[PDB]
Amino acid sequence: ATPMQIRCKFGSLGTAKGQFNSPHGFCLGVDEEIIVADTNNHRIEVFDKMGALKFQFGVAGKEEGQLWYPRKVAVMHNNGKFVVCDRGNERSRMQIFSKCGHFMRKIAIRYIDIVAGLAVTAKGHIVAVDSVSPTVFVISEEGELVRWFDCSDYMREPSDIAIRDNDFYVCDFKGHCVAVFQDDGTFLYRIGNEKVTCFPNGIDISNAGDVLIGDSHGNRFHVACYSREGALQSEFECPHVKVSRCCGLKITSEGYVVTLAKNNHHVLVLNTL
């Protein structure tokens, strides 16, 4: 496996600016800021790629505009708005914030149990995948349910999702693979398997269209790189350092790999050797 080096490791357990408490999700921003859903502190934290905090937003609570254990975050490429999913009254809740972090609106998602994966398409549609009843939902910026399709026959437990142009690649945490769907919802094929991609919890798609699938089975961060059609190209690991368990996977334009060490309350930015 090709080694990965630590380019930046930032965060520690706490409440202070730049600290985390069990962060469950992250994304990249319009300017590829590292944007973290700092779950147990009820806030979003926005960083540059060397871990410098730009700003944070979020007050703990269940009022509209407040955050309550936010676990997933995405940014709308065309206007910088944040899409944040947390726990509302009883069930999951989706809220839209401005690029300043100001509450704009709540999107009713009573048809979703758990948001296990969150992404935004090129056209500006919000994609949320449910892990309990495996289902994909495509949602407009103004809250319209544009499309949904059932994937329970083809998936066990979704854990992340990525989109390239118009197909959906869904991480199957308990299926040990990625499931590929069209925008139609028509299933196409799977990428990976239990040998290489064990308990995958992160996926992103390189510019070239390759599929990067992250896992931390051996308590070290491992990445498998597949072609768009499912041919294993390479594997990556951090052999010279003992990386913790991680979740999520995003590729920066430089080719750096970003993941979240949820159980150790920090972000990792990695480069290939």
Author numbering: 931 to 1203
Paper text:
The TRIM-NHL protein Meiotic P26 (Mei-P26) acts as a regulator of cell fate in Drosophila. The TRIM-NHL protein family shares a common architecture that comprises an N-terminal tripartite motif (TRIM, consisting of a RING domain, one or two B-Box type zinc fingers and a coiled-coil domain) followed by a C-terminal NCL-1, HT2A, and LIN-41 (NHL) domain.
We solved the structure of the Mei-P26 NHL domain at 1.6 Å resolution by molecular replacement using the backbone of the previously determined Brat NHL domain as a reference model. The two molecules located in the asymmetric unit are connected by a di-sulfide bond between Cys1030, but the functional relevance of this dimerization under reducing conditions in vivo remains questionable. In the center of the molecule the six β-sheets form a solvent-filled channel with a diameter of ∼12 Å. The overall structure is stabilized by a β-sheet complementation of the first N-terminal β-strand (aa 933–940) with the sixth sheet (aa 1178–1202) in a molecular velcro-like fashion. The N terminus of the NHL domain remains invisible because of averaging of its conformations throughout the crystal but is present as there was no indication of proteolytic degradation during purification and crystallization. As with Brat and Lin41, the NHL domain of Mei-P26 and Thin/Abba also exhibit a highly positively charged patch on their top surface. There is, however, one notable exception: three amino acids important for the recognition of the first position of the RNA target by Brat (a uridine base interacting with Asn800, Tyr829, and Arg847) are conserved in Mei-P26 (Asn970, Tyr 999, and Arg1017).
